[PDB]
Amino acid sequence: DYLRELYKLEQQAMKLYREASEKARNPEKKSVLQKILEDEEKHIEWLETIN
């Protein structure tokens, strides 16, 4: 349950951060968003790492 809802939310985050990073024009902002996006992708990977 918890893990699945977390996975769902991480997927939502990846989608939103990708879109946001693509809409951003200020390179510093784009960079911050891409950095967070990488983190969420990492979380997704980490969640797929269980038992």
Instruction: Please give the residue ranges that form the binding site for a second copy (CB under 8 A).
Output: 2-3, 5-6, 9-10, 12-13, 16-17, 19-20, 23, 26, 28-29, 32-33, 35-36, 39, 43, 46-47, 49-50
Q: Which of 33, 12, 13, 11 is nearest to 24 (CA)?
A: 33
| Position closest to Mn ion via CB | 43
- Which residues, 6 or more positions from 34, have their beta carbon under 8 angstroms from its beta carbon? 17, 21
Task: Verify binding: residue 40, Mn ion, rule CB under 5 A.
Answer: yes
Q: Please check whether residue 24 is in contact with residue 33, taking contact to mean a CB–CB distance below 8 angstroms.
A: yes
CB of 21 to a second copy, least distance (A): 10
